[PDB]
Nucleic acid binder design. Structure first.
Ligand SMILES: [K+]
Ligand SMILES: [K+]
Ligand SMILES: [K+]
Ligand SMILES: [Mg+2]
Ligand SMILES: [Mg+2]
Ligand SMILES: [Mg+2]
Ligand SMILES: [Mg+2]
Ligand SMILES: [Mg+2]
Ligand SMILES: [Mg+2]
Ligand SMILES: [Mg+2]
Ligand SMILES: [Mg+2]
Ligand SMILES: [Mg+2]
Ligand SMILES: [Mg+2]
Ligand SMILES: [Mg+2]
Ligand SMILES: [Mg+2]
Ligand SMILES: [Mg+2]
Ligand SMILES: [Mg+2]
Ligand SMILES: [Mg+2]
Lengths: 77, 149, 106, 271
RNA sequence: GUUUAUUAAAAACACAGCACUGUGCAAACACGAAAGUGGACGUAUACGGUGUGACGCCUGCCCGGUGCCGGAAGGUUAAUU
């Protein structure tokens, strides 16, 4: 499923609205990318399906803190 | 990204620099190699106290690199036998694996990424020049001779 | 048994390997019970027109007596050898042995 | 080889066949055989995804060595065999250690001929070398695009490619389409051209011959109803529309290539 | 040969043959939110699409309109700033 593993961002639903205000159903997808993160505390690469926002969260907090939060919610990697 | 350098890198700075680099440069190169660490409070403080330790380790490895470059320059001639047809032309090639294995056969060990063959992969026999680096500064040279098997 | 005149020109950066060529082709003819009648290494000389952007070539003249099949294998070797840039194979009526003008003049 | 049938029946009048008397008349080599069962042009959703596929003669599959990676060991050609899976004949060959393999049959190969593979093989048809060692100007077939992957270019009967240039780590090839393509020079190819070049001279002669090969009838779009096909409809024969596929894309000139990943390897497109 | 099971079997459909066009392989295309699968364990003498319809003699002129291919110097032109 298209879920960011760090922030939990999901596809959501909204409307295409045209000029004549015709509304059709549409989805908004997260900007997901698979990425290998280096973990300095266990000499390893960990692959995460992460949004670009979650990449910025990992840059702000550190990879070890984020992996501790994912271990707290479950969410094995 | 505001990063602190753990070693001298290119045209960025020396050991100890509050340097602003691009986020991909910090994320994909400088942090997964032992060259940099982000500017976090703990990180900043840690480095300050470890600064001495680093300076020392930073040198012990330049002295070992100079010793290995001196052993390469003492060696200076390595022979590889391979299949050559007529006109002194190799049917195969002398790979980086073959150059590294011949250097380990001649002396104490040298891994694969240390060789900097400037032209190619030695498609012909004769005397060739191969460069070796064990650090960011030392660039030592080896004559390699390829003979027919 | 037919008599042939062989001229071939080697690329001048391969001129250090032309004794190997001559001994190889003489061994190839004499393994087929053939005779070499004249061997002449004219060396490096300038060309009248450029050939593969080269201004000089190494010249070797042979006069052999050999079977047709080993002569055909010789020109197949000539075609698939990168070092020789041009060769000519000529039938001659008899065996010749006297010196060519380009060693007679010197 | 190319034989015209006598008109003893109207389905026999236009039949033109090809006969190869040196093909093996017996059963194929059993350890290189494999089942391949028909799809009907149906994918794993059970839906027709390619039209006009169905029926025909059931066929076993022959494991053909497209890789030719048994280097340095010569092989003699045992026999030439018909292959139902492809337009080219294949050759059962026997290596010097006792291993038997199937290769594609080149043009001038028969029983008793010797083939070899590797970097030091001689330049003769049926021999496989990396393209660094093949001289420029040669005619080759069974051409790899990635080194070690196996031959993918010029496998069909009568086909071949030309090595026209060699720049560094790449060679330039002229393909049968007329396109010019870069290929890595460490890739392998087999000298010569693929045999059975008279295969395109056959005439099937009747509807049933194509039904034996497993092709179902094509219905023209202009014979359909407008619900079935964009060309469908009309009182009598009408058209009055630009010609398109059944899914509406224009089909008489519109280009459909869109691969920016392999565009760096195309020197000149076909014309 | 095929067709309106149940008012139409035909001149309709198909057909071998012909032509145009797409497609260099992770092919085009198709089914599929996707993974994947068919195409194909095939590789341009191959595969898809379209029109024509054995065979024989042949297939003239028009690129202004619509489409498609190619060009890109100018003119116009989106988000962004
Ligand atoms: K119609
Ligand atoms: K009827
Ligand atoms: K027009
Ligand atoms: Mg079809
Ligand atoms: Mg066949
Ligand atoms: Mg048709
Ligand atoms: Mg109708
Ligand atoms: Mg319907
Ligand atoms: Mg419609
Ligand atoms: Mg109609
Ligand atoms: Mg009408
Ligand atoms: Mg009938
Ligand atoms: Mg009825
Ligand atoms: Mg009736
Ligand atoms: Mg019609
Ligand atoms: Mg007309
Ligand atoms: Mg016009
Ligand atoms: Mg245009």
């Amino acid at each position: 499923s298209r879920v960011c593993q760090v922030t939990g961002k999901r596809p959501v639903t909204g409307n295409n609205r045209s000029h004549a205000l015709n509304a059709t159903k549409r989805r908004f997808l997260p900007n997901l990318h698979s990425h290998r993160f280096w973990v300095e505390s266990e000499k390893r690469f960990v692959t995460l399906r992460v949004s670009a926002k979650g990449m910025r969260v990992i840059d702000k907090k550190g990879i070890d803190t984020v992996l501790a939060e994912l271990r707290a919610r479950g969410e094995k990697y | 990204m505001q990063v602190i350098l753990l070693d001298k890198v290119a045209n960025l700075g020396s050991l100890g620099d509050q340097v602003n680099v691009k986020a991909g440069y910090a994320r994909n190169f400088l942090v997964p190699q032992g060259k940099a660490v982000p500017a976090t409070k703990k990180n900043i403080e840690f480095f300050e106290a470890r600064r001495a330790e680093l300076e020392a380790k930073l040198a012990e490895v330049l002295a070992a690199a100079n010793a290995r470059a001196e052993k390469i320059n003492a060696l200076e001639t390595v022979t590889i036998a391979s299949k050559a047809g007529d006109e002194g032309k190799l049917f195969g090639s002398i790979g980086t694996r073959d150059i590294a294995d011949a250097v380990t056969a001649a002396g104490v060990e040298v891994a694969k990424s240390e060789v900097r063959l400037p032209n190619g992969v030695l498609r012909t026999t004769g005397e060739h020049e191969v460069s070796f680096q064990v650090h960011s500064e030392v660039f030592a040279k080896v004559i390699v001779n390829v003979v027919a098997e | 048994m037919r008599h042939y005149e062989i001229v071939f020109m080697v690329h001048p950066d391969q001129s250090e390997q032309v004794p190997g060529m001559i001994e190889r082709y003489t061994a190839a003819i004499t393994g087929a019970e053939g005779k070499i009648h004249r061997l002449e290494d004219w060396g490096r000389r300038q060309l009248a027109y450029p050939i593969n952007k080269l201004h000089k070539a190494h010249y070797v003249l042979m006069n052999v007596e050999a079977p047709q099949e080993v002569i055909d294998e010789l020109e197949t070797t000539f075609r698939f050898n990168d070092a020789v840039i041009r060769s000519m194979v000529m039938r001659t009526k008899h065996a010749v042995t006297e010196a060519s003008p380009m060693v007679k003049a010197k | 080889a190319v034989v015209k049938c006598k008109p003893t029946s109207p389905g026999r009048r236009h039949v033109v066949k090809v006969v190869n008397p040196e093909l093996h008349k017996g059963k194929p080599f059993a350890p290189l055989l494999e089942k391949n069962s028909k799809s009907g042009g149906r994918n794993n959703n059970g839906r027709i995804t390619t039209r006009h596929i169905g029926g025909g003669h059931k066929q076993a599959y022959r494991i053909v060595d497209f890789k030719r990676n048994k280097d340095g060991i010569p092989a003699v050609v045992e026999r030439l065999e018909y292959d139902p899976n492809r337009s080219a004949n294949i050759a059962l060959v026997l290596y010097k250690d006792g291993e038997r393999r199937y290769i594609l049959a080149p043009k001038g190969l028969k029983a008793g001929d010797q083939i070899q593979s590797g970097v030091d093989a001689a330049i003769k048809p049926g021999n496989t070398l990396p393209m660094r060692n093949i001289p420029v100007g040669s005619t080759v077939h069974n051409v790899e695009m990635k080194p070690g992957k196996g031959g993918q270019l010029a496998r069909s009967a009568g086909t071949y490619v030309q090595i026209v240039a060699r720049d560094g780590a790449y060679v330039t090839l002229r393909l049968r389409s007329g396109e010019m393509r870069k290929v890595e020079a460490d890739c392998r190819a087999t000298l010569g051209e693929v045999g059975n070049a008279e295969h395109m001279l056959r005439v099937l002669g009747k509807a049933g011959a194509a039904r034996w090969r497993g092709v179902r009838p094509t219905v023209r779009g202009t014979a359909m109803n407008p619900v079935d096909h964009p060309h469908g409809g009309g009182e009598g024969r009408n058209f009055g529309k630009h010609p398109v596929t059944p899914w509406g894309v224009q089909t008489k000139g519109k280009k459909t290539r869109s691969n920016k990943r392999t565009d760096k390897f195309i020197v000149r497109r076909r014309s």
